[PDB]
């Protein structure tokens, strides 16, 4: 057990041992971006592939070319923290070595006349942080992986839902990564037809003729030939035995049935047969027949044979005639029919028809048509069937060559057409489009590579154009490349893409789920409205790959999925899941990662299968699945097993205890709202958990995990210094590790990110141990909510529907109080009248509002501010303003007139009260810094000086301790060393060369220990001192950070992990809560009526388990309080940890006395228990736990009404449930407006709380008012409340003067409509 987990061991109720630990949760992002950035010597992945795909760039004439050499990434200007603070993108410069070889015109082509090599700046590539996030424009973003259709050829059908009859129509679609789409479909008349780029449809023989194929060649390829010679003045068909198995059969020795089995007569075998003439009448020819004497074509290929044609062939002397095979079941004349309808007769006419289909209304030329075809599919510049696409294509048509080609060809197209024909005939099956073997995962690396290639093509056109011209004597290759298009492409991808999303940062679980999210939307994907039922459904191939529970509930159902716990992406981008090999009947611990196509063949048993001591299956017929169908299978027929019980559910679903007792509908909600929890002041572990919390907490990156083991040297609320162990030191290193903790930092959702130390001075720590707990973390365990005592009973209608009744003590102990950090900005700009100034001289404002402001006009740090308080005082110059006569008289009476500048200052939003915790001042280069700017600059410089001095002091203490040890190799009295003053050591004098050379280099190194640290400190001074690059016209930006403590109150949404959400209805006093016989009141009362109908039973079990857990904790607390002997405590702990037949063996013999006391101290507030999903605690284990804690086995206690003291007539389920505070607070949702801003065009109230807008009275509301008959209320809403500019002002005046009457007018929207219709050249006028 690790040190961090030995502090509080969670009891495991699982029974199945785990053979594979859950892998790193953020691998899907980090691996992809490492593929993108890391150099590939093979040149197949990342920036190298794009470079070699675009380069070399060749001039049209041939004068010169630009070729690729290598690339590298420079050092970042800022780190992550400074990029976030300043508001700039965290990125690395890209420098590419390019050389411009110049060819010699006089010399033959290919002679290198000159070479010019230079490094070219090709833009800034954004960098992925260690946690899989990007810092774009100062904010954290996550790029969501995309589930898109895999490139290749897909065979599908209309399922008989298009034509009037059934007529199942089959089509084949060739979809590349880049290029045009090729479609081969059938028509209701049984003709193969071809489409390119989804335009007007043509016969499929045109694409065959444009490759130089004669009709005879087409018939030979797509048909089998039966031959008919003339032997001994008789008809002579070459008999193929398989064909025979309406006439009299020849071979009189073996006569078959006449005009009315086959194998018995075919056993002897003959090669002769005679058929009537009519048998030839119905057939069609196969080749063109030419007569030399006549010089004409007697019969053409693909023509109906007639008696006259037979006679003509007879007179021509020809004896051999071959005709195509045609049936109604297995072989079809489709190709012959589409040859018949097709009017093309040569390659040129086919190209002309293809050109008319591509480019209509343009004169067709041979060179133009030829070019169009070559480019559409056979050009690597415009067509790319990538490696995954080529692999899928070859698997589809069974081709075992051209594995490195990305352009279609003769064999590919003809194989696709043949396979479609075979599928129609009956041999073959259509493909499933929802099958995960046909859908691919496309991650950050691939998308970034594609956008970089787009930018490179943009720069390649201009590079080609400039290379065409020949003035390259004084031209360097850095003068040819413009990095702005490339930078624009990458910035567009990383900031404006639909899949580049604002990070969800409510809690670590939200972060992890967002990093493991897959979207079917985005570029190259689906749309919300056009998506159908089929793509939203759960496929049988989603087992172990996509979570069937976690998905948005709404328009995005089925379109956004979550990666499974053990799911992985192979090199081709297809999801794969691990399985255990079954060898010789025993389940080997060897893990094979299988994809859906490989999964289909094998028979896979489930993790719930019983196993014996020898490793084999217990029961003869085990449950398993094959080809996506579950069933019962023999033991010897099992090939694979599941690796874990949480293999099919995602992390959020895996964090729900007793998931197997909950419906999928409510498990969906539980998983969704586990990502909406808001961290509280005090993070508390869940009493009932699943054991995955540690993985989420560690892998989210919110916690401070030790990089190297050792002993903690120093702990402080913002810094941890660790003395590294002697076995893990890099030679010549300081020997210390410094962890600076994040303290009260705004998140993306205006929450608080705070890291609290969980280690004391002198505590040993190993690698991977948790040093500081981030938000929603308790001792390295994910802690999203709080454990609350729960009573399942109705209480006077205050838990009606989904309402929640909460005791006042919950508010008193601040169990659900949350810190929300809000950022406000004041931008002083340059206007035409003048420059806006930030100052404390605010007109028309008294000294009361200037108390919290300083001389510079910025609020102090730590000032408690309420709504309307001035934070930054800003005055803007204002133009001449015309005054009414009454205002002139007022100014003449009282001579107060000071309107040179107008007060537009930053004020706290209404109903917001908090403390200013941070102020940041950004000043443009060349603008005088106000006193507050220099104060913050001095504070930052002092902080940098102190931090560098302290860091250097600790690291030099460690390194001088190493020096000390190197001396201790011999061992002496360093008291003599201290006899000479520390600085005076450099003043010593040694004459011996052995000692003096030592002293020489020691002095030369001590003086050099100053140059590097001075360089570091000078770089820091440069960063704080330098000016900020603001937007044009912006002079100064002042940002104020407000910390607001939000307590629980009625209207706040609170929920558990089983989908039972609710809104708090009343904060009841403690004396009105139900209480047990011991006088302990319940804190939250829930309605039982919501359990049975939604069928989420896992909460009740959890409640029972929670009760038992707390009971055991109480016992431990009692044992601690009574100061009992440690032997009794050890015995009790062993008894607690030995309950049930679990996989966990926690024995306390090797736990030291201090370790035992620490564990008991951590178990005071209840014993944590782990119930893995689908391997949870049975009811018997819960009952045994309850009996241990001296509690009823039914989990129901006798409660008393606090308002009367009378016991309730029935026992009530009382326990402890883990409840969360969702990010839906009534403070941010309560809005009201009487009059405010209005729209510019429609003259209507704006929309939103941020704009102080009004509610929308939509069409349905108008219908309801009309149904009521409320004409006057409807007229009020339409005219005097929305867009009657005179009417609403008159109504306001009338209400102010008491007369509640209105004078309705004409809405401005109708006038806008009138003007628009008149602008459309239509006379609309209101008759009178």
């Amino acid at each position: 057990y690790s040190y961090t987990e030995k502090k509080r061991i969670r009891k495991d109720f699982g029974t199945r041992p785990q053979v594979l630990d859950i892998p790193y949760l953020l691998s899907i992002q980090l691996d992809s971006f490492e593929k993108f950035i890391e150099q590939d010597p093979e040149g197949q992945y990342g920036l190298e592939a794009a470079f070699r795909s675009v380069f070399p760039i060749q001039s049209y004439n041939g004068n010169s070319e630009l070729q690729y050499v290598s690339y590298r990434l420079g050092e970042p200007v800022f780190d992550v923290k400074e990029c976030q603070i300043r508001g700039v993108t965290y990125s690395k410069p890209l420098r590419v070595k390019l050389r411009l070889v110049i060819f010699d015109k006089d010399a033959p082509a290919g002679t290198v006349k000159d070479i010019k090599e230079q490094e070219v700046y090709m833009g800034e590539i954004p960098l992925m942080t260690e946690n899989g996030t990007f810092v774009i424009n100062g904010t954290e973003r996550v790029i969501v992986s995309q589930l898109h259709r895999s490139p290749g050829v897909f065979f599908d059908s209309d399922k008989g839902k298009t034509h009037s009859s059934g007529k199942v129509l089959y089509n084949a679609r060739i979809i590349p990564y880049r290029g045009s789409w090729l479609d081969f479909e059938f028509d209701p008349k049984d003709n193969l037809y071809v489409r390119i780029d989804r335009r007007r449809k043509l016969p499929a023989s045109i694409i065959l003729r444009v490759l130089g194929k004669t009709s005879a060649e087409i018939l030979d390829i797509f048909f089998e030939k039966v031959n008919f010679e003339v032997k001994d003045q008789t008809l002579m068909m070459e008999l193929v035995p398989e064909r025979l198995r309406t006439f009299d059969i020849e071979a009189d020795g073996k006569v078959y049935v006449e005009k009315g089995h086959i194998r018995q007569l075919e056993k002897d075998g003959v090669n002769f047969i005679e058929v009537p003439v009519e048998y030839i009448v119905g057939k069609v020819s196969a080749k063109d027949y030419v007569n030399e004497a006549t010089g004409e074509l007697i019969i053409t290929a693909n023509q109906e044979i007639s008696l006259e044609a037979l006679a003509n062939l007879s007179q021509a002397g020809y004896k051999k005639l071959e005709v195509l095979f045609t049936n109604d079941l297995d072989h079809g004349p489709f190709m012959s029919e589409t040859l018949r309808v097709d009017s093309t007769t040569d390659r040129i006419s086919a190209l002309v028809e293809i050109y008319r289909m591509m480019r209509p209304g343009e004169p067709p030329t041979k060179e133009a048509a030829e070019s169009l075809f070559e480019s559409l599919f056979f050009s690597a510049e415009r067509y790319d069937l990538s490696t995954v696409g080529r692999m899928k294509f070859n698997s589809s048509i069974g081709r075992e060559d051209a594995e490195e080609q990305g352009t279609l060809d003769e064999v590919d197209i003809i194989e696709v057409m043949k396979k479609l024909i075979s599928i129609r005939n009956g041999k073959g099956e259509v493909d499933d489009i929802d099958h995960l073997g046909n859908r691919r995962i496309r991650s950050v690396g691939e998308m970034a590579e594609n956008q970089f290639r787009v930018g490179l093509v943009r720069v390649e056109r201009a590079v080609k154009e400039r290379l065409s011209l020949g003035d390259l004597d004084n031209v360097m290759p850095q003068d040819l490349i413009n990095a702005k298009p490339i930078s624009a492409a990458v910035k567009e991808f990383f900031g404006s893409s639909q899949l580049s999303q604002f990070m969800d940062q409510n809690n670590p679980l939200s972060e992890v789920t967002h990093k493991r999210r897959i979207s079917a939307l985005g570029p190259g994907g689906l749309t919300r409205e056009r998506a159908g039922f089929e793509v939203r459904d759960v496929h049988v191939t989603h087992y172990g790959r996509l979570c069937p529970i976690e998905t948005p509930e709404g328009p995005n159902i089925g379109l956004i999925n979550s990666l499974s716990a053990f799911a992985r992406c192979n090199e081709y981008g297809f999801l794969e899941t691990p399985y255990r090999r079954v060898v010789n009947g025993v389940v080997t611990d060897e893990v094979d990662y299988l994809s859906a196509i490989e999964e289909g063949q094998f028979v896979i048993a489930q993790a719930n299968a019983k196993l014996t001591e020898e490793g084999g299956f217990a029961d003869e017929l085990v449950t398993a699945r094959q080809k996506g169908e579950s069933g019962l299978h023999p033991r010897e027929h099992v090939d694979y097993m599941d690796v874990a019980t949480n293999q099919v559910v995602s992390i959020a679903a895996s964090l729900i205890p007793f998931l197997e007792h909950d419906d999928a509908n409510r498990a969906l909600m539980g998983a969704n709202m586990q990502r909406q929890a808001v961290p509280t002041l005090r993070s508390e572990k869940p009493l009932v958990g699943t054991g995955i919390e540690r993985n989420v907490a560690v892998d989210s990156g919110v916690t401070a995990v030790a990089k190297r083991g050792g002993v903690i040297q120093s702990v402080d609320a913002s810094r941890i210094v660790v003395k590294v162990n002697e076995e893990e030191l890099i030679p010549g290193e300081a020997g210390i590790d410094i962890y600076n903790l994040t303290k009260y930092t705004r998140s993306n959702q205006n929450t608080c990110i705070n890291q609290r130390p969980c280690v004391m001075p002198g505590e040993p720590v190993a690698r991977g141990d948790v040093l500081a707990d981030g938000p929603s973390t308790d001792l390295g365990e994910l802690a999203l909510g709080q454990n609350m005592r729960i009573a399942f009973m109705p209480w006077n209608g205050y838990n009606f529907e989904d309402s929640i009744l909460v005791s006042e003590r919950v508010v008193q102990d601040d169990r659900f109080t949350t810190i929300h950090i809000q950022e406000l900005s004041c931008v002083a700009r340059d206007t035409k009248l003048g420059a806006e100034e930030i100052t404390a001289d605010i007109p028309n404002v008294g000294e009361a509002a200037l108390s919290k402001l300083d001389e510079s006009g910025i609020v102090y740090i730590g000032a408690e501010v309420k709504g309307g308080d001035i934070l930054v005082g800003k005055v803007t110059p204002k133009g001449e303003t015309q005054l009414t006569p009454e205002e002139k008289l007022l100014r003449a009476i009282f001579g107060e007139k000071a309107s040179d500048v107008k007060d537009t200052s930053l004020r706290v939003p209404n109903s917001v009260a908090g403390t200013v915790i941070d102020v940041q001042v950004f000043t443009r280069d060349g603008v005088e810094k106000d006193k507050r700017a220099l104060e913050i600059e001095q504070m930052q410089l002092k902080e940098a000086k102190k931090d560098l001095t302290e860091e250097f002091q600790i690291l030099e203490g460690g390194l001088l301790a190493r020096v000390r040890s190197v001396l201790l190799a011999g061992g002496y009295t360093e008291a003599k060393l201290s006899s000479i003053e520390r600085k005076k050591w450099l003043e010593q004098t040694l004459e011996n060369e052995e000692l003096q050379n030592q002293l020489e280099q020691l002095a030369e190194q001590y003086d050099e220990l100053k140059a590097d640290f001075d360089k570091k400190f000078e770089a820091k001074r440069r960063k704080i001192t330098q000016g900020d690059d603001l937007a044009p016209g912006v002079l100064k930006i002042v940002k104020v950070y407000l910390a607001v403590k939000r307590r629980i109150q009625p209207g706040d949404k609170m929920a558990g992990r089983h989908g039972n959400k609710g809104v708090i209805s009343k904060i009841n006093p403690v004396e009105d809560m139900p209480y047990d016989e011991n006088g302990q009141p319940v804190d939250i009362v829930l309605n039982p009526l919501g359990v049975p109908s939604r069928m989420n039973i896992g909460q009740i079990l959890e409640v029972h388990l929670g009760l038992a857990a707390k009971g055991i904790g109480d016992k431990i607390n009692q044992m601690i309080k009574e100061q009992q002997e440690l032997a009794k405590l050890r015995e009790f702990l062993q008894k607690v940890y030995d309950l049930g037949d679990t996989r966990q063996r926690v024995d306390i013999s090797e736990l030291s006395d201090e370790d035992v006391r620490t564990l008991a101290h951590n178990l005071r507030a209840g014993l944590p228990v782990a119930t893995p999903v689908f391997d949870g605690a049975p009811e018997s284990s819960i009952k045994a736990m309850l009996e241990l804690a001296d509690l009823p086995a039914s989990g129901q206690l006798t409660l008393f009404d606090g308002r009367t003291g009378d016991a309730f007539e029935r026992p009530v389920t009382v326990g402890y449930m883990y409840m969360l505070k969702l990010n839906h607070l009534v403070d941010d949702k309560m809005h009201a407006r009487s009059t405010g801003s209005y729209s510019l065009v429609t003259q209507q109230p704006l929309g939103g709380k941020a704009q102080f807008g009004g509610q929308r009275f939509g069409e349905m509301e108008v219908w309801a008012l009309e149904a009521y008959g409320a004409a006057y209320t409807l007229q009020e809403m339409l005219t005097v409340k929305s867009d009657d500019v005179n009417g609403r002002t008159k109504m306001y005046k009338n209400i102010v003067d008491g007369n509640h009457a209105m004078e309705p007018g004409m809405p401005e929207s109708f006038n806008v409509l009138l003007k628009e219709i008149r602008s459309l050249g239509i006379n609309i006028e209101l008759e009178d």
Binding site: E1266, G1269, A1270, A1271, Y1272, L1274, Q1275, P1304, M1306
Partner: peptide, 26 residues
């Protein structure tokens, strides 16, 4: 057009106008 609907409390109002219409059209 922001006028009273010819249903419910506006009905009589609209009716009145129609009467006046006819009476003026006389």
């Amino acid at each position: 057009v922001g006028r009273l609907i010819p249903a419910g409390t506006g009905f009589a109002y609209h009716q009145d106008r129609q009467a006046k219409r006819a009476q003026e059209q006389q």
